[PDB]
Write an enzyme that holds these catalytic residues in place. Structure first.
Site, PDB file in Angstrom:
ATOM      1  N   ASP A  21      -0.262   5.219   0.667  1.00 49.72           N
ATOM      2  CA  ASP A  21      -0.483   6.240   1.677  1.00 49.72           C
ATOM      3  C   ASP A  21      -0.455   5.597   3.077  1.00 49.72           C
ATOM      4  OD1 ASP A  21      -1.025   7.946  -0.580  1.00 49.72           O
ATOM      5  OD2 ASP A  21      -3.167   7.678  -0.361  1.00 49.72           O
ATOM      6  N   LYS A  29      -9.289  -2.212  -2.800  1.00 49.69           N
ATOM      7  CA  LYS A  29      -9.126  -2.976  -1.587  1.00 49.69           C
ATOM      8  C   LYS A  29     -10.236  -2.589  -0.617  1.00 49.69           C
ATOM      9  CE  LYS A  29      -5.356  -0.514  -1.123  1.00 49.69           C
ATOM     10  NZ  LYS A  29      -4.421   0.090  -0.165  1.00 49.69           N
ATOM     11  N   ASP A  52       0.851  -1.166   0.000  1.00 44.98           N
ATOM     12  CA  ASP A  52       0.000   0.000   0.000  1.00 44.98           C
ATOM     13  C   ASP A  52       0.899   1.232   0.000  1.00 44.98           C
ATOM     14  OD1 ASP A  52      -2.371   1.554   0.278  1.00 44.98           O
ATOM     15  OD2 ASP A  52      -1.731   1.880   2.331  1.00 44.98           O
ATOM     16  N   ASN A  91      -5.765   2.919  -2.925  1.00 38.11           N
ATOM     17  CA  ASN A  91      -7.153   3.282  -3.192  1.00 38.11           C
ATOM     18  C   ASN A  91      -7.313   4.755  -3.539  1.00 38.11           C
ATOM     19  OD1 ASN A  91      -8.244   0.743  -2.873  1.00 38.11           O
ATOM     20  ND2 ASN A  91      -9.043   1.086  -0.804  1.00 38.11           N
TER      21      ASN A  91
HETATM   22  O1  UK9 Z   1      -8.656   9.368  -3.615  1.00 33.92           O
HETATM   23  C1  UK9 Z   1      -8.142  10.350  -3.043  1.00 33.92           C
HETATM   24  C2  UK9 Z   1      -7.550  10.255  -1.740  1.00 33.92           C
HETATM   25  C3  UK9 Z   1      -7.012  11.334  -1.113  1.00 33.92           C
HETATM   26  C4  UK9 Z   1      -6.266  11.323   0.143  1.00 33.92           C
HETATM   27  C5  UK9 Z   1      -6.087  12.499   0.867  1.00 33.92           C
HETATM   28  C6  UK9 Z   1      -5.309  12.506   2.016  1.00 33.92           C
HETATM   29  C7  UK9 Z   1      -4.705  11.341   2.456  1.00 33.92           C
HETATM   30  C8  UK9 Z   1      -4.878  10.170   1.747  1.00 33.92           C
HETATM   31  C9  UK9 Z   1      -5.654  10.157   0.596  1.00 33.92           C
HETATM   32  O2  UK9 Z   1      -7.025  12.581  -1.680  1.00 33.92           O
HETATM   33  C10 UK9 Z   1      -7.574  12.765  -2.934  1.00 33.92           C
HETATM   34  C11 UK9 Z   1      -7.540  14.055  -3.466  1.00 33.92           C
HETATM   35  O3  UK9 Z   1      -6.980  15.105  -2.807  1.00 33.92           O
HETATM   36  C12 UK9 Z   1      -8.084  14.275  -4.731  1.00 33.92           C
HETATM   37  O4  UK9 Z   1      -8.073  15.551  -5.207  1.00 33.92           O
HETATM   38  C13 UK9 Z   1      -8.644  13.218  -5.447  1.00 33.92           C
HETATM   39  C14 UK9 Z   1      -8.667  11.945  -4.909  1.00 33.92           C
HETATM   40  C15 UK9 Z   1      -8.134  11.700  -3.644  1.00 33.92           C
HETATM   41 MG    MG Z   2      -2.919   3.274   3.236  1.00 34.01          MG
END
Ligand code: UK9
Ligand code: MG
Ligand code: UK9
Ligand code: MG
Lengths: 294, 294
Positions: free
Chosen positions: B27, B213, B25, B59
């Site tokens: 993030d 997932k 993974d 994801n």
């Molecule tokens: O699927 C997304 C997940 C996240 C995300 C934000 C913080 C921590 C982890 C994941 O941010 C996004 C985003 O800023 C977008 O503009 C478009 C999609 C996503």
């Molecule tokens: Mg993660």
């Protein structure tokens, strides 16, 4: 236990005769959209002539009480007092007045996801709303509850802001109702408060306090200033998971009318599964079928 | 069964030695926000030197593959091929190409709740999007799927339009993922796709097909063009309900890293409740702890 019996004949006369009053859901029961159910005004006139109380309970938060009263009048339901009308907007305002956390010398504010009827009810109950003007100093009051209602202007940004307020575990999360969707005149549907609450709950990890039916809090709100014995009150609704469940939780005899959301086959499927709190005691095709019992 | 064992020492050498590759993974595992986890680039260099495959599965639908590849490079993860990177945006596009209903001579369109990275992936897979220009005639193509992704422009109006398309029971409902929220650098959170999907599901009465997932479909997507034996693949993630559950459903050995969303105490509570599909086989404080096993 409830057996989903078609209410008619001598049984109808006995059930109505023993009842001291009737609690009606509104949408899907008295009207559909802007069309009154034929015969529904005449039922309410006959109930009154018979000395039976009538009260009304809706999860719809579009209309503050004055605009709700005018709607009753317009669709043929005359002679009503505004004090007979209870919406989730009214009862959510009252619940927040009763339960908002914080000190009496520094009252909190409510962050509202909802429309102008709902906001009007909140202000009439003395609640201050997030976004309202700050005092001369400029220090905005602390948000001590998030209220989710029917919000035609719901947005990702409003959802994220709700989550920010809910980071404080002492900030309440309240929803007017959990109805998932509502039918429109052409067979489409519009999303309901329950869909928005689902997003707020999921993003924040919180469970909402629900004000409206099927929560028994709505019966506390209705009965604050009117003494009605639930054992002598008929609950008449169109939605199994809100009106009929409400009636069972409050100890009322429940009547499903078929002019609205829930179908007879659904009630019968719940009965066959043994889920008796979602089964009406009785059903009618429409509430006009009740008038003959008087 | 999984017992949430701290992975170290001889056990660490044996687990990594037997693994043919590692599925990471992104993030919460390789980075937090714009900060790489210290030691994570060095682990990936050592894995490659050891002849172990590395694949990546996220994801997050913010970045189409080219912009995702550049992000890896920027945070110190060099030498990677774009073909090693799998996001829910890529895999949702591929699933829709494989499953969109309708005749081959009159292809349908996808109504998308999501951002420009997601839309770019959909178009690169050949999918037409609702709202795209109509042909000279002007007759818009029929919407045959609703796709819910991370949508910073989500609105009540978009939710109601999704419900209108979903009135057709043959119209698919697909979600990129069900992650409920994501952490931000300051401890706040942003709503996740799962919160938006919850609103769409609740309003429409439909259950979404989830691509990402913990759905095993994501492992089908990853393995379409790379042969990896799940019995020889380590799954490394930070989220019990998505990464670890995924690993169990696919038959992989699972490793929870503690630099992200899920806490060790949560994994231990699931184990005490006997919910073994949410228990990691192993945990590490951060993936830098794995390097010593090579
Ligand atoms: O699927 C997304 C997940 C996240 C995300 C934000 C913080 C921590 C982890 C994941 O941010 C996004 C985003 O800023 C977008 O503009 C478009 C999609 C996503
Ligand atoms: Mg993660
Ligand atoms: O709570 C509400 C319920 C409904 C509703 C719509 C169709 C059938 C039944 C109920 O509509 C609303 C509305 O249009 C508003 O502007 C504000 C609130 C509501
Ligand atoms: Mg109703």
């Amino acid at each position: 236990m409830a057996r989903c019996e078609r209410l008619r004949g001598a049984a109808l006369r006995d059930v109505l005769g023993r009842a001291q009053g009737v609690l009606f859901d509104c949408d899907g029961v008295l009207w559909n959209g802007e069309r009154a159910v034929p015969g529904a005004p005449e039922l309410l006139e006959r109930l009154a002539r018979a000395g039976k109380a009538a009260l009304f309970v809706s999860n719809n938060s579009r209309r503050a009480r004055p605009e709700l009263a005018l709607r009753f009048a317009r669709l043929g339901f005359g002679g009503l007092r505004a004090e007979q009308l209870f919406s989730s907007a009214l009862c959510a305002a009252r619940l927040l007045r009763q339960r908002l956390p914080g000190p009496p010398d520094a009252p909190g504010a409510v962050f509202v996801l909802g429309g102008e009827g709902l906001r009007a009810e909140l202000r009439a109950a003395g609640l201050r709303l997030a976004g309202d003007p700050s005092a001369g100093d400029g220090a905005a009051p602390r948000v001590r509850a998030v209220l989710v209602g029917y919000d035609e202007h719901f947005s990702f940004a409003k959802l994220r802001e709700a989550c920010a307020h809910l980071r404080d575990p002492e900030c309440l999360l309240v929803a007017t109702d959990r109805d998932p969707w509502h039918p429109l005149s052409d067979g489409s549907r519009t999303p309901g408060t329950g869909s928005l609450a689902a997003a707020v709950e999921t993003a924040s990890g919180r469970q909402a306090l629900v004000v409206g039916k099927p929560s028994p809090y709505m019966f506390e709100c209705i009965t604050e200033n009117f003494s009605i014995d639930p054992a002598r009150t008929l609950m008449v609704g169109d939605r199994l998971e809100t009106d009929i469940l409400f009636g069972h939780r409050c100890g009322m005899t429940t009547v499903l009318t078929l002019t609205g959301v829930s179908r007879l086959e659904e009630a019968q499927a719940y009965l066959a599964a043994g889920q008796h709190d979602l089964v009406p005691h009785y059903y009618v095709e429409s509430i006009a079928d009740l008038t003959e019992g008087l």
